[PDB]
Design an enzyme around this catalytic site. Structure first.
Site, PDB file in Angstrom:
ATOM      1  N   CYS A 253       0.835  -1.199   0.000  1.00  9.14           N
ATOM      2  CA  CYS A 253       0.000   0.000   0.000  1.00  9.14           C
ATOM      3  C   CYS A 253       0.869   1.248   0.000  1.00  9.14           C
ATOM      4  CB  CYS A 253      -0.943   0.019   1.208  1.00  9.14           C
ATOM      5  SG  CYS A 253      -0.132   0.028   2.817  1.00  9.14           S
ATOM      6  N   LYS A 254       0.350   2.307  -0.612  1.00  9.32           N
ATOM      7  CA  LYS A 254       1.008   3.601  -0.599  1.00  9.32           C
ATOM      8  C   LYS A 254       0.632   4.287   0.696  1.00  9.32           C
ATOM      9  CE  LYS A 254      -0.385   7.181  -3.112  1.00  9.32           C
ATOM     10  NZ  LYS A 254      -0.538   8.152  -4.230  1.00  9.32           N
TER      11      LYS A 254
END
Ligand SMILES: [Cl-]
Ligand SMILES: [Cl-]
Length: 150
Positions: free
Chosen positions: A32-33
């Site tokens: 995930c960012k």
């Protein structure tokens, strides 16, 4: 308990990717960012995104300063618990090793190591660094997970 010496919070800001984790909670994926930005209280807002169905969900975690630079506290109302979060090691430009531990409430037992990388493709040396880091923290090989891009 170790915190990155001479921690520079402004250099820690910006876009990161959660590239690995190890934890003592079985149920706790994919990469995930995360976006790290300053919080009003002098600490950090950590904003992460993930895909579900056709949409990108956004979550923010407020990391409050906890008494030393690179050390934070996070309060989770849904779990009735507080957690300490420390940036143990970072070079700011490539990677960060984080360690989180329950401090109060029913999550007091919880422990987790997190690998943050500035790119979506962590180099082998950084994966080895993270494996060795988790091992130092008493996490066994079975609990260590590298998070794949998309
Ligand atoms: Cl120093
Ligand atoms: Cl490295």
């Amino acid at each position: 308990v170790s915190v990155q010496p001479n921690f520079q919070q402004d250099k820690f800001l910006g876009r990161w990717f959660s590239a690995g984790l190890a934890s003592n909670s079985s149920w706790l994926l994919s990469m995930c960012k995360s976006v790290v930005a300053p919080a009003t209280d002098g600490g950090l807002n950590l904003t992460s995104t993930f895909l579900r169905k056709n949409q990108c969900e956004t979550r923010t975690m407020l990391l409050q300063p906890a008494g030393s630079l690179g050390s934070y506290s996070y309060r989770s109302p849904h779990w009735g618990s507080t957690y300490s979060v420390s940036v143990v090691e970072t070079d700011y430009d490539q990677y960060a090793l984080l360690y989180s531990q329950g401090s109060k409430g029913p999550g007091e037992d919880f422990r987790m190591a997190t690998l943050y990388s500035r790119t979506q493709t962590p180099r082998a040396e950084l994966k080895e660094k993270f494996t060795a880091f988790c091992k130092a923290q008493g996490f066994t090989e079975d609990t260590i997970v590298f998070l794949p891009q998309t």
